[PDB]
Design a binder for this molecule. Structure first.
Ligand SMILES: C[C@@H](c1cccc2c(-c3ccc(NS(C)(=O)=O)c(F)c3)c(C(=O)O)[nH]c12)N1C[C@]2(C[C@@H](CN)C2)OC1=O
Ligand SMILES: [Zn+2]
Ligand SMILES: [Zn+2]
Length: 232
């Protein structure tokens, strides 16, 4: 009823959208992993009479439900998708997207990691993102590689029309008291990568984490703090 959709509020398999700004939505779905249930976010950005999708809804059936929810709530076709790192909450559902005619993209680093680990593999490689601080344009967004953080390949996404910073899993929500799933993280480099985000996007008005509630720029410093506390 208007609040940001939450883990116990979304049954696994259902997707909800949340309007962030004009032409910008997040998508929220829930999934089970190792016997616990988690929410996750992605982004939808209007691209004229088409849509750009950022990240799957964490699973094949969730991603099919995402496409149906987009058709119900927005009614414009998803033509392209970018996955922001190689984990299943970002690429699981790429096969569904590809069979729905969506062109799927990720950095070569993400594609290699997904392939090696047995996750679904986006079709098209995004060059120009291999060095920290790199940025490229992709439709209505800028893609930025901040350096290793949650994963070595993690990308962030900025929507310049709306000053929306989608941090993906390199950014945590304010209520987080831990650093999430750090299995593939670089805890030592993560604060440096967050500092690069802060320096590059000082005008961000909304910051969206990979999991949990959006907020403002405070999410960046908070993320550095929780990561340093996990490491220390
Ligand atoms: C698929 C993904 C995965 C699965 C389950 C949970 C998460 C969380 C997570 C947990 C707790 C919080 N809340 S919090 C900050 O603690 O309070 C949060 F926000 C996010 C994250 C994330 O942090 O992005 N991602 C998860 N996977 C799986 C895996 C393990 C590797 C295989 N050995 C691949 O790594 C990974 O990320
Ligand atoms: Zn991850
Ligand atoms: Zn994640």
């Amino acid at each position: 009823s208007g609040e940001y959709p939450t883990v116990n509020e979304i049954p696994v398999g259902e997707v909800r959208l949340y309007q962030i700004a004009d032409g910008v939505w997040s998508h929220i779905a829930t999934q089970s992993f190792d016997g616990a249930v988690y929410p996750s976010n992605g982004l939808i950005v209007r691209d004229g009479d088409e849509l750009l999708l950022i990240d799957t809804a964490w699973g094949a059936k969730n991603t099919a439900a995402l496409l149906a929810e987009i058709e119900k709530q927005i009614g414009l076709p998803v033509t392209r998708a970018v996955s922001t790192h190689f984990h299943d909450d970002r690429v699981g559902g790429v096969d569904v997207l590809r069979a729905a005619g969506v062109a799927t993209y990720a950095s070569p680093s993400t594609r290699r990691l997904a392939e090696a680990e047995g996750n679904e593999i986006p079709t098209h490689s995004l060059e120009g993102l291999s060095s920290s601080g790199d940025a490229v344009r992709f439709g209505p967004v800028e893609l930025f590689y901040p350096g290793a953080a949650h994963s070595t390949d993690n990308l962030v996404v900025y929507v310049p029309s709306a000053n929306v910073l989608y941090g993906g899993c390199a950014v945590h929500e304010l209520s987080s008291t831990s650093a999430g799933n750090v299995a593939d993280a670089d805890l030592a480099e993560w604060p440096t990568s967050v500092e690069r985000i802060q320096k590059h996007y000082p005008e961000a008005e909304v910051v969206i984490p990979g999991h949990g509630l959006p907020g403002g720029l405070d999410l960046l410093q908070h993320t550095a703090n929780v990561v340093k506390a996990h490491k220390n």
